[PDB]
């Protein structure tokens, strides 16, 4: 039988016509998440709570409501139930919700919890803003000229998970229906050679980069960069640089900037012209560091996404408060993208910070503005006044080292 | 017939034993390169000859032999040619060549032919040495923290080049394999799908991290670091990095650090014990920023590496001036590691830093040692008197603008 409690007081999001109806009482149900999500779930909860207190003067209130997935998972419904089916049928009924950090166990051919989540839920886009929150300690002399949003898509790539181990009788299989079926000669070494498969599609492109766009012209954006690997990858990669600015001319009137390749694309609302451009992701990986402020919203494939998500957070400082979100159609859960650092569960130490903006962002997409504008405020506040947890306070001097739930207060205290 | 030139005076280099017998004059076959090759190259050619003339006082003498690949070869042997089958021949041949910047035409169906002459010579390993030279412009705050030797295999990956475009018979034919044969369920979008193949075998994976090994050894350095996404693709990244450990257990008595997974190589030479140790590559992207001096050998696949290596070439401003090797069991091209960039084409502005250093990497390769280390002394020299290109000095206040000739002079003069 479940142990997920409903709240006795507290009302159902709904979804009309791709809009979210949401009641000043909404469910929302979240996930504690492995090791450090002990300490950073509390922070966040709090915070959370605090700003919509203070946003709405009383008038609103989450019914937080615990689900379950991963560790925590098996020791509420024993053994084997790492991601119990209740879990996602949950987070589709209640159309948002939240989570600390997952970790997979090793040995028992399971595979990636989170991306377990996002393709069973179908959260076909994985939106990772990362921008520079001044005082933060960085490694790059000027981290405030990163302000970019990232649409890493979340169905398809190698990440996918198809894939046969070498020496296996499958492997064998597709390698020789490859070779003699396929006629291919490019396998240097057949035996003993493991193979994944990578798919893109012009569904799957065209859902993404439709999301960046709309994303670009709701905000008022500069530009949208398709960022890929098509000069190597010509049918995947490269497919899907040509579906995205298809998809800008078909979708949003985009013309041609000079002699090509870049459009332009008229916002409906401000009149802006914003620039699709596109550039080869090693290039890219330069770029950001090199040029950061000629970049905003990027749209790219789900690894590619990944390595340029991090590698932007690690870039501005901003490491362990990612915020991030996986979002469909039906349903979106946010959550926070650090590890979860068991070596530090329990000891109220780690920076809540990733969760926290996470939290923003689900605050946002709930048509609550306010409040999320508030939490941006607070985070801000904290960073600026140097009162901070260990992994700032180890790279500076002058800082107040604080402990997590202190950082959450702290953050309160700055709104 | 052939308008390759053997140069009368020269010899050629020969391979015995895994061990190369190069002459006083040897013959080294040279590709100009398109666009900028026009400027680098003669610079390149000029900065070397200085080197070897003032290291063996006139005893030893290179003849070059101009051999070609891309734009000019089409305008040498005509217009279908890109890449003459004589030109693999050579290379082979002479067991040592370099090459400038190669840019490859688009609506003609050919593929990268920096990864042709990779893949057809069996150039496994790309080689790519990144450290800091005092005195260049970077985005980071401390770029001297940085000094790591990229080991990226060169023959296997998705950059084999295996895929099929969406809506062809081929694609289509592939993917009904998969779901009817193979059983494969997690293709979210069969229709209109482009599908790319990503091998990974183990004595591709073991020879790339033999090399790794063995220059960690020769060279005495601190570690070689297995990076990969083994979380995420277990049966190609994954196995890459199980491969590369096993290894270093088998073939170099690796022994378990504490309760592992890294294990510790003796160096049979210094009796330093190098740490082999492997790290998640979206982590490694951030790592690299943050944490630069607990790494130096690294050894992954072919999209990993190049990610890698560009990254690390930005980070320490040396975007345009990041030497690279491509070497194989018979043969060994250097080259040029930034694009044409055609439009300063024969205007002698760019730097012509890569292909030195790639030309100093060269050097080495053939026992040249000591005209290898003047290069090296002559570029640091150069670059800390802040008389440089356009590119450096364009980010920097007080420095004296050259010309690419002119750049290639002060490396001489700093020697
Ligand atoms: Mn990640
Ligand atoms: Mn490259």
Redesign the interface.
């Known amino acids: 039988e479940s142990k997920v409690v409903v709240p006795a007081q507290g009302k159902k999001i709904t979804l009309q016509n791709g809009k979210l109806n949401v009641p000043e009482n909404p469910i929302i149900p979240y996930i504690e998440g492995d090791g450090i999500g002990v300490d950073v779930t509390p922070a966040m909860l709090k915070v959370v709570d605090a700003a919509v207190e203070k946003a709405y003067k009383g008038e609103r209130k989450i019914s937080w409501m615990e689900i379950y997935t991963g560790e925590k998972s098996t020791q509420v419904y024993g053994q084997d139930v790492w991601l119990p089916a209740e879990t996602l049928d949950l987070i589709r009924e209640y159309r948002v919700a939240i989570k600390g950090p997952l970790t997979?166990p090793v040995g028992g051919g399971i595979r990636?919890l989170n991306?377990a989540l996002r393709?069973e839920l179908?959260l076909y886009i994985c939106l990772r803003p990362v921008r520079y929150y001044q005082g933060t300690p960085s490694?790059?002399?000027?981290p405030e000229l990163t302000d970019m949003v990232i649409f890493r898509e979340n169905?398809?790539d190698?990440?996918?998970?198809?894939?046969?181990?070498?020496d296996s009788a499958?492997?064998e299989?597709?390698i020789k229906?490859?070779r003699e079926?396929?006629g291919?000669k490019?396998?240097?070494?057949?035996?003993?050679?493991?193979?994944?498969?990578?798919?893109?599609?012009?569904?799957?492109t065209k859902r993404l980069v439709r999301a960046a766009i709309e994303y670009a012209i709701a905000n008022d954006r500069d530009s949208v960069t398709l960022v890929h690997?098509g000069?190597?990858?010509?049918?995947?990669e490269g497919?899907f640089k040509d579906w995205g600015y298809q998809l800008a001319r078909e979708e949003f009137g985009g013309e041609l900037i000079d002699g090509g390749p870049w459009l332009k694309v008229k916002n409906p609302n401000t009149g802006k012209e914003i620039v699709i451009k596109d550039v080869i992701?090693?290039?890219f990986?330069?770029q950001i560091?090199?040029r950061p402020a000629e970049y905003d919203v990027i749209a790219c494939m789900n690894?590619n996404g990944?390595?340029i998500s991090?590698?932007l957070?690690?870039?501005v400082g901003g490491?362990g408060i990612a915020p991030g979100a996986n979002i469909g159609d039906e349903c979106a859960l946010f959550e926070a993208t650090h590890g979860t650092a068991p070596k530090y569960a329990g000891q109220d130490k780690v920076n809540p910070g990733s969760i926290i903006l996470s939290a923003e962002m689900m605050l946002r997409h709930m048509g609550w503005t306010e409040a999320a504008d508030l939490i941006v405020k607070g985070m801000e506040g904290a960073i600026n006044a140097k009162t901070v947890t260990y992994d700032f306070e180890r790279l500076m001097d002058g800082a107040k080292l604080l402990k997590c739930s202190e950082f959450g207060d702290a953050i309160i205290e700055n709104m």
Request: aromatic content about 8%; charged content about 25%; overall charge negative.
């Open positions: 997979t990636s991306v393709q179908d490694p790059v002399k000027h169905s398809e190698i990440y996918a998970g198809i894939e046969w181990k070498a499958d492997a299989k597709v229906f490859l079926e396929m291919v490019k396998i240097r070494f057949p035996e003993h050679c493991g193979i994944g498969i990578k798919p893109c599609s012009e569904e799957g690997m000069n190597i990858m010509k049918f995947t497919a992701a090693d290039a990986l330069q560091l090199l690894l990944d390595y991090d590698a957070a690690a870039q490491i």
